[PDB]
Amino acid sequence: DGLTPLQLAAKMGKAEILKYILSREIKEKRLRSLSRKFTDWAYGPVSSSLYDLTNVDTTTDNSVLEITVYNTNIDNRHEMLTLEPLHTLLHMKWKKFAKHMFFLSFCFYFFYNITLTLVSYYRPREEGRMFVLIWAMCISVKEGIAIFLLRPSDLQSILSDAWFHFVFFIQAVLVILACLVLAMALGWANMLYY
Amino acid sequence: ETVENVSKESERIWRLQRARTILEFEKMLPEWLRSRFRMGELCK
Amino acid sequence: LKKRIFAAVSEGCVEELVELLVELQELCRRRHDEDVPDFLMHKLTASDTGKTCLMKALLNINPNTKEIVRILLAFAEENDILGRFINAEYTEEAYEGQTALNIAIERRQGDIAALLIAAGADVNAHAKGAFFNPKYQHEGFYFGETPLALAACTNQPEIVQLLMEHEQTDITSRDSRGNNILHALVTVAEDFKTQNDFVKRMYDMILLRSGNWELETTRNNDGLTPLQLAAKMGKAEILKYILSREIKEKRLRSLSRKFTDWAYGPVSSSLYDLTNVDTTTDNSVLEITVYNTNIDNRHEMLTLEPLHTLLHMKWKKFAKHMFFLSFCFYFFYNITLTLVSYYRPREEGRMFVLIWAMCISVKEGIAIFLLRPSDLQSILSDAWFHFVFFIQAVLVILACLVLAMALGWANMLYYTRGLHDVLKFLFVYIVFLLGFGVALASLIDAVLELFKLTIGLGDLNIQQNSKYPILFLFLLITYVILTFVLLLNMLIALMGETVENVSKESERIWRLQRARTILEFEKMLPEWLRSRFRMGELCK
């Protein structure tokens, strides 16, 4: 299952070698064509480290992109698996990607998601809602099959869990299927987003 | 022992939990979208 | 030859450099259809970048490169090209004119810098580029060329002293965006994290060689005076030395602020002459500390920065002069009028009170333009009166229930001048109450009155409106679940770390918050009102 050393060591959450595998500042000559850290940018008080990395990072074969996200093991990784901050590991992508996509995922859209759920709940027959369920079913479709990654069964300790999985998986089926289950799905998802 | 858990419940766990969920956003785009070519970033 | 020299210089090879010299000698011997001081066939770069001669040894610092750089200059010395090579400057938006100055600045190469000016002191020239005329701080700093300042900017007075010892130094030239060498160290102020006295010695050493006050002669950009420029960014370390400057001995000390010649004795009367400027015309310390607007980890953690004349002088008298009567001699009517105005129903000194209220709305309404603020910034220093009174004047002149909210919000603020942790907490309950309420309370005007977690009304099952039998019975179990986390929510926050914040919430913050607001009183009077001529006050 991807016997590359970058992922194979990260598959089991091997912390000690993970720190050396990424932050590899090889020096001197006749070598250092390998490794990831290689600083030749004049240094100075203004440091511009050239963590060349190379290998593969967040493309095609899984190396560090989702291996840390979906280690699924105990994975007492770097910094007690606190996203393993090692140069390019967390200080690179999260310094920019957090404010690029994830920032608008829960903020630019959930304001309608929360309002629609309240509006949908506050819709009695007295005896953008359609667009909201478009992404909701997509997440149900996406994470519904994303469980097949590795061999997980349910919530595992407090390392990393996907609470959206259970609430939205029953959400889409029950709404299309009285129909009091729309409320429990609404609240359980509502707390998770916050 | 309520004081010990609360002071050590979010801590580093929130940083990994949020980053991993955000890291899944890279799986919803094709190879055309390319950012941060290489070499990492700069420091102090 | 040039490629051979570049390869030898880039790799630090010494013998290969001599081989390139022989090739260069042959080309010069042959008829080149030019003179000796020709273009040299672009020996360093063909109008591409810099890194000329010994500049390669700078970025390739090696034990062999020290002798090679000297040898290259030595060969260039007896070649009638030393001046041209020393004066070589780049022509790129990134590198332009740095020459051996910035090369010897980013790397602590004292001997290379020393021998650079010896062959030619062309490093004294300016520097412009991406890191020589930089921008938002991600590629360089504000050295403004000035190799004497660059060594000082590199926390190297020893190299800085040697350069300043030479003549022709542009110590009187601000250069670049415009700030002199004394103004330069403010850009390299830093904190005590990595330098406790490294930046202090440079400012003292330069002033020591600064015979006159010309060192503190700058008013470029936004008041480039060193008293305000250093205080603009809240540079604590230099702020303590800038004010409490007890210069002694002779042939000096005409500058500085502290100068005690009042017989001393057990009854101290310190003559903190200050001079310069203090609370008049140009902003020096009057409102700079009050409106730093930055993080400004200033003196005493920016606790109004008590440094002799800084706080012990004005606040010892001005607090009881004007601010004492501002909130006491008038607010007794302000509070009474607001209650009276609120207690004025149509049943279907008030005019004078709004005179100052609109004035504050007019005053602080435009006072926001000072620096570049947007809203409340952390807990350093805020103007709560701004929002409450700005809407107060407009809404009252514009039903009219907004007069009450303005009354209460201002009323609390005045007593405050005589909660961030809870602010996060109250949002959590409010967010959760909306979610939990929408889950079942709205599922089965508002009905959020059930949030009386402390006491109040009980449960009485769930019967408020449309109590027909529905699946809300199962939601009551979830209601217990919601109740369970609400109990844990307050328990975790209230009992978690409440003791630490309260013991360190007012502390020094009240001293700076009150003094800054009082310090604004000096801006409401003309130059006729003059107090505390100079010299500070006396001591024990």
GROMACS .gro file of C-alpha atoms in nm, chain B residues 3 6 42 44, chain C residues 138-139 492 495:
model
    8
  197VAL     CA    1  -0.942   2.072   3.581
  200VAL     CA    2  -1.031   2.083   3.022
  236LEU     CA    3   1.074   3.202   0.415
  238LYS     CA    4   1.248   3.557   1.015
  376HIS     CA    5   0.920   3.984   0.393
  377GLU     CA    6   1.251   4.030   0.205
  730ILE     CA    7  -1.524   2.402   3.208
  733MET     CA    8  -1.372   2.677   3.693
   0.00000   0.00000   0.00000
